[PDB]
Design a protein around this ligand. Structure first.
Ligand SMILES: [Ca+2]
Ligand SMILES: [Ca+2]
Ligand SMILES: [Ca+2]
Ligand SMILES: [Ca+2]
Ligand SMILES: [Ca+2]
Lengths: 262, 263
């Protein structure tokens, strides 16, 4: 019998090494656990903001659910330059990470779910529709499903103009160079028609102080046969208040207990 | 022969597992390399913001300098609750990390330096002064040396009031609880009298848009026998523009080439 452990994991997808962390519950040798794979947001890292995914991972681990989270390609400690990042490759990696994680010794291939934050929720929704028979459930926090509308119609990315990409040669995201390839690839992305292909249990948690409009969470619900939408009064995009951090962890543990343990 | 590699490392300090990443250059079996140990800022993680420490780590690694960076206790993936965090224990961990990292198999303990960002620069400056023979050189980005003055004199932590910590039991830092122990421990901290004990090469990089007042960088320089201050026009606290990111990486590689590869 081995106590719980935190270990570091890697995988190779399309020639990039993706680097991640796994939180494995207490158990006997060779035990396979229900597992949540977590997708971080745009230009974020696998910890997410202010220990958010770390706290969620430990909460799951203490309750018998393994938690795995990788840096996407061109993010965090994974290989790849942000200038080469495209959302299509994030989607390819998210699908490939299902098989990478289900191959791990401690993961029950039949009790496996996705959790997302922000753009990671958008990726999770699309991967879930394309790999619907792989997922026991799907949980989406603060989904950034407005990102196509904002960039393509309002010509901004998180409020900053995208109209100087040709003049500058890049878009400046907090000191990272985001390339033209990202913007050229946006025409290939479909969120909601792909997302409605997943008809397992879905939970969406939206905070009223999120800068993403609430209507995008309702649009997801319009397409889900088994959706639940929780509106957290005065929650924000990253669950960056003490009360809303407790709320997001509790609501999510409740959902994964119901769908992966009960 | 071995190509460069990224490996994950852990060490135990005062009952907490601290978790870190090491970037090891290309080399022969058992080769040892000049090494930079990096200290992140307050409530940050070992990647620092927007890949900052990752980019610096890879730049060093590509040039034959190993880079090591841990989450401090109560930060990132390391053990410890933020409610229990104190700066004194950060200083103790920084001291213990010098010893743990100097014993790593790929580290040349005779060519070993610290790099800091923000509060990590303050920690680096104090540890460097207390362990004045241990470091080949010291580089500080955007040192947050105002933090005691801000909390103790202006009664704010990054602009938010600290006056309710005793009544309410904690301070809310972006969803994390920061306990009274942190605030009670501030009286134990001395920055500048400790920092001036280090007499090796020091480089400070300050951006004109940093919210930390420039005067604090001059106070450090006033106590350093062998200091250099670079002032980056339009640089900010976290080096969060493409031009200022290029500048900070280039200036720091230049300093570590001089102090770790050419000396
Ligand atoms: Ca246990
Ligand atoms: Ca593979
Ligand atoms: Ca690789
Ligand atoms: Ca090489
Ligand atoms: Ca431990």
């Amino acid at each position: 019998y081995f106590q719980s452990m935190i270990k570091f994991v890697t995988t190779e997808i399309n020639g990039l090494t993706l680097r991640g962390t796994a939180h494995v519950p207490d158990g006997e040798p060779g035990q396979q656990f229900p597992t949540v794979l977590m997708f971080h947001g745009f230009g974020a890292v696998r910890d997410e903001g202010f220990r958010l995914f770390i706290q969620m991972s430990n909460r799951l681990m203490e309750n018998g659910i393994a938690a795995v989270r990788f840096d996407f390609g061109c993010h965090g400690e994974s290989d790849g330059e942000f200038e080469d990042f495209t959302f299509s490759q994030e989607l390819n990696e998210g699908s490939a990470l299902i098989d990478a994680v289900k191959s791990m010794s401690f993961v029950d291939s039949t009790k496996f779910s996705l959790l997302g934050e922000a753009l990671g929720s958008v990726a999770a929704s699309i991967v879930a529709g394309k790999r619907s028979t792989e997922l026991t459930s799907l949980c989406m926090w603060s989904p950034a499903a407005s990102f196509l509308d904002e960039i393509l119609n309002d010509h901004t990315l998180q409020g900053k103009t995208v109209d100087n990409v040709e003049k500058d040669g890049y878009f400046d995201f907090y000191g990272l160079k985001l390339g033209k390839a990202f913007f050229d690839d946006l025409k290939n992305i479909n969120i909601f028609d792909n997302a409605k292909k997943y008809q397992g249990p879905v939970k969406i948690v939206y905070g009223t102080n999120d800068f993403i409009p609430e209507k995008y969470s309702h649009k997801y619900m319009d397409g889900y046969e088994n959706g639940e939408l929780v509106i957290v009064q005065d929650g924000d995009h990253g669950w960056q208040s003490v009360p809303s951090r407790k709320r997001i962890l509790d609501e999510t543990m409740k959902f994964f207990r119901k769908t992966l343990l009960e």
